[PDB]
Amino acid sequence: MPMQMFMQVYDEIQMFLLEELELKFDMDPNRVRYLRKMMDTTCLGGKYNRGLTVIDVAESLLSDGARRKRVLHDACVCGWMIEFLQAHYLVEDDIMDNSVTRRGKPCWYRHPDVTVQCAINDGLLLKSWTHMMAMHFFADRPFLQDLLCRFNRVDYTTAVGQLYDVTSMFDSNKLDPDVSQPTTTDFAEFTLSNYKRIVKYKTAYYTYLLPLVMGLIVSEALPTVDMGVTEELAMLMGEYFQVQDDVMDCFTGKVGTDIQDAKCSWLAVTFLAKASSAQVAEFKANYGSGDSEKVATVRRLYEEADLQGDYVAYEAAVAEQVKELIEKLRLCSPGFAASVETLWGKTYKRQ
Amino acid sequence: MPMQMFMQVYDEIQMFLLEELELKFDMDPNRVRYLRKMMDTTCLGGKYNRGLTVIDVAESLLSDGARRKRVLHDACVCGWMIEFLQAHYLVEDDIMDNSVTRRGKPCWYRHPDVTVQCAINDGLLLKSWTHMMAMHFFADRPFLQDLLCRFNRVDYTTAVGQLYDVTSMFDSNKLDPDVSQPTTTDFAEFTLSNYKRIVKYKTAYYTYLLPLVMGLIVSEALPTVDMGVTEELAMLMGEYFQVQDDVMDCFTGKVGTDIQDAKCSWLAVTFLAKASSAQVAEFKANYGSGDSEKVATVRRLYEEADLQGDYVAYEAAVAEQVKELIEKLRLCSPGFAASVETLWGKTYKRQ
């Protein structure tokens, strides 16, 4: 049901965007068609949990037919603002990582006649489409200024996160736009504290706080909740998401490549913070190569350091913190707090 | 004087942005310093005509000390929103063109330890900084919603322009994200009508309409002028700017490379629309190569087709249209119309 409405508002948003390009930007149908395909490929095919969260939050805050009809439709449009924003970051981050595929289709910039030259701009369009849809559908809403400001702020936040991700490669002290660096990692930046900072800004704001905020706004309920507790829940849930991902990447789509990719994962930083000198040097020697001997070594080390045990203890401490915060929130905001529970239930030990 | 104020508000904006990153995004001074340098290098060193225009428009619309002080300070901040937006497009477009230098320094992504991976994101930051500065300096202004909407709309418009630029390479009919194309040009898209469309969206909105609009907004004067005449002037001036540039690139920094680069210039499209079959085939054979025989041939052809004569006639028709529109505008808006005159005076036969 939520999904049906969601996908219906997709077509209605697509329609508006494509027509406007025709009527107002003089666009011919060859180019309109290219952008339709870019839009579909970049925005469709995931689970839409970010966007669906907005719907679910708006449904729980509803407390004569047609306020409900409008609030839910607003929720769907906000939901798609988040999905298109995410698509924007994926397209740009894939180019930035020189990644290869996504869903098990190719990275957008890797399609045969999309080019790195076109794809960068395609990203820019995807993010402008968030503004254009907000400005069209919410032209007359009193929350429009506030929505744009909060959205802009999360946008910025996410680009900042991507800065931290991008500069996790080498000693921050040698950071200089005039002076090359080896694209061997250092590991100098592979600390828990840096990892937590990357995840928080790159990921937790847009994935967990923004959908909750948007559901609040379109329900006109934002002042009714404790925003400090709400952010804290978002940051914790968001962090747990990525750590859960990082672990499953190693120890469970088809199978993941963070080790080969030499990623700053929870595993790597947690391993480095507890390991012996000998373990460290063997890590450094084996990490970040496709070679299936080098990989297997890294997994072995991860296994000897009992990282899965550490994971299980981290998970349970997060759960108990999440649970206390949800109860603080339920004191004043019982409907909002249930929606957060439900969000947490779609993250905790996956699904 | 305007410049002194402008550069002063630069430091004040920089300060706010860098501190916020420290206080609110947890940023360490290695990374703060990298972004200071990125900001300075990407935003400083041009003539700032876009930003200066905003100041000049606000000064002409002023019709007890301190309204003037605030309006001009608002004008400077809007001016820098335009300069940072421009920097954003330059950084991203340079990557997209694989260009080499700019001012006669390197393209930002070409600095030794900036990387294509970092530079794409640096672009994204530059554009978020426009939002962050508007939201901070104009938090309490009644025009903030309207400013963000108009700004967003020009942002979108410019990305659309860049789509048209990017797909000027080959037959629009073969535009397909699944199917490669030769990075030989077609010339099929090299028509005047396509050229005018690229320039209008890529360039005229952000370079000519946006500064005028922003000066109107911060002066609280926007409703006092005829916006249809204002847009028309902006589109004409903006078009003339690029055509004037395209011509000087050939027939006058140190010397330009549009022919080698195989650019969609005014010269090329105008040449193609009037040339004989023989001239066309010799053009196609010689255009878009570094070889100084092939280049010289193209210039010769341009000279035989009398493109400089066509330019001179185009310039004079634009001038007389610009002049009539300025007088229509002066009927109701004498102060605004002088500022446009002054803007036109900095474009017409350069300076």
XYZ file of C-alpha atoms in Angstrom, chain A residues 136-319:
184
model
C 6.543 22.715 -7.259
C 4.602 20.417 -4.840
C 5.042 22.558 -1.717
C 4.875 26.034 -3.336
C 1.984 26.932 -1.084
C 2.971 25.133 2.118
C 4.152 27.108 5.150
C 6.835 24.590 5.872
C 8.608 25.091 2.495
C 11.356 27.445 3.759
C 12.049 25.231 6.740
C 12.113 22.048 4.665
C 14.566 23.540 2.215
C 16.841 24.787 4.935
C 16.938 21.432 6.813
C 17.348 19.562 3.559
C 20.171 21.827 2.422
C 21.829 21.353 5.722
C 21.761 17.555 5.446
C 22.994 17.864 1.860
C 26.051 19.803 3.109
C 26.532 17.389 5.947
C 26.729 14.497 3.514
C 29.331 16.170 1.326
C 31.346 16.784 4.482
C 31.074 13.073 5.322
C 32.367 12.333 1.840
C 35.358 14.583 2.497
C 36.217 12.470 5.576
C 35.740 9.247 3.498
C 37.954 10.527 0.711
C 40.740 11.565 3.082
C 40.870 8.366 5.055
C 43.612 7.162 2.623
C 46.664 8.800 4.063
C 48.115 10.841 6.888
C 45.939 13.862 7.265
C 49.201 15.795 8.023
C 50.391 15.391 4.450
C 47.121 16.838 3.091
C 48.100 19.377 0.456
C 46.561 20.217 -2.878
C 50.033 20.941 -4.389
C 51.756 17.663 -3.355
C 50.870 14.142 -4.653
C 50.429 11.106 -2.349
C 50.784 7.396 -2.821
C 47.481 5.608 -3.259
C 48.722 3.040 -0.851
C 46.954 3.731 2.417
C 48.818 4.756 5.460
C 46.316 3.215 7.884
C 47.190 6.275 10.031
C 43.589 7.492 9.721
C 42.119 4.063 10.463
C 40.923 4.836 13.937
C 37.493 4.202 15.440
C 37.060 7.875 16.091
C 37.587 8.781 12.399
C 35.450 5.886 11.285
C 32.576 7.062 13.545
C 32.876 10.570 12.139
C 32.731 9.393 8.537
C 29.669 7.267 9.145
C 27.869 9.938 11.124
C 28.108 12.652 8.484
C 28.230 10.582 5.362
C 25.402 8.391 6.217
C 23.476 8.808 9.427
C 22.045 12.243 8.802
C 20.576 11.500 5.358
C 19.646 7.886 6.014
C 18.110 8.117 9.518
C 17.603 11.732 10.671
C 16.286 13.235 7.394
C 13.446 10.773 6.832
C 12.265 11.294 10.406
C 12.481 15.054 10.139
C 10.606 15.091 6.907
C 7.808 12.998 8.293
C 7.559 15.435 11.195
C 7.463 18.500 8.870
C 4.731 17.289 6.531
C 2.682 16.238 9.569
C 3.261 19.664 11.133
C 4.411 17.961 14.255
C 8.088 18.879 14.468
C 7.786 21.030 17.591
C 6.008 18.165 19.440
C 9.154 16.030 19.852
C 12.458 16.157 21.587
C 14.882 16.814 18.844
C 17.998 16.065 20.898
C 16.751 12.517 21.613
C 15.647 12.198 18.019
C 19.129 13.109 16.644
C 20.841 10.800 19.069
C 18.678 7.901 17.977
C 19.393 8.763 14.371
C 23.141 8.899 14.922
C 23.189 5.597 16.821
C 20.937 3.755 14.334
C 22.847 5.203 11.465
C 26.164 4.105 12.908
C 24.895 0.644 13.654
C 23.613 0.312 10.052
C 27.067 0.818 8.599
C 28.872 -1.360 11.119
C 26.320 -4.141 10.545
C 26.935 -3.699 6.804
C 30.759 -3.718 7.261
C 30.702 -6.930 9.170
C 28.311 -8.780 6.808
C 30.502 -7.686 3.942
C 33.150 -9.969 5.457
C 31.340 -12.713 7.302
C 28.137 -13.656 5.363
C 23.793 -9.624 -3.119
C 26.826 -11.788 -3.738
C 29.884 -11.640 -1.543
C 31.617 -8.333 -0.584
C 35.049 -6.861 -1.357
C 35.963 -4.289 1.429
C 39.289 -6.110 2.150
C 40.406 -6.054 -1.513
C 39.169 -2.540 -1.806
C 41.213 -1.621 1.266
C 38.176 0.107 2.807
C 38.068 1.909 6.181
C 35.619 -0.607 7.681
C 34.625 -1.088 11.309
C 36.539 -4.366 11.128
C 39.774 -2.801 10.085
C 39.717 0.019 12.617
C 38.556 -2.201 15.474
C 41.198 -4.776 14.496
C 43.887 -2.123 14.424
C 42.961 -0.709 17.793
C 43.413 -4.041 19.613
C 45.989 -5.904 17.570
C 49.614 -6.903 18.543
C 52.511 -5.423 16.541
C 52.893 -8.723 14.724
C 49.213 -8.864 13.803
C 49.388 -5.250 12.651
C 52.338 -5.835 10.304
C 50.741 -8.909 8.797
C 47.528 -6.919 8.290
C 49.375 -4.105 6.607
C 51.102 -6.645 4.309
C 47.946 -8.410 3.224
C 45.153 -5.831 3.102
C 44.027 -4.165 -0.136
C 44.785 -6.780 -2.793
C 42.552 -9.012 -4.978
C 44.831 -11.985 -4.367
C 42.804 -14.667 -2.607
C 45.770 -15.655 -0.433
C 46.125 -12.107 0.890
C 42.375 -11.790 1.513
C 42.154 -15.149 3.311
C 44.990 -14.081 5.601
C 43.025 -10.887 6.533
C 39.921 -12.897 7.269
C 42.005 -15.305 9.335
C 43.410 -12.318 11.354
C 39.891 -10.912 11.756
C 38.861 -14.374 13.038
C 41.809 -14.690 15.483
C 41.115 -11.231 16.859
C 37.443 -12.362 17.447
C 35.963 -9.319 15.676
C 32.599 -11.137 15.363
C 32.458 -11.513 19.090
C 33.290 -7.750 19.362
C 30.526 -7.028 16.866
C 27.987 -9.005 18.928
C 28.865 -7.058 22.041
C 28.761 -3.719 20.144
C 25.272 -4.683 18.721
C 23.822 -5.469 22.107
C 25.053 -2.205 23.700
C 23.602 -0.225 20.779
C 20.268 -2.090 21.149
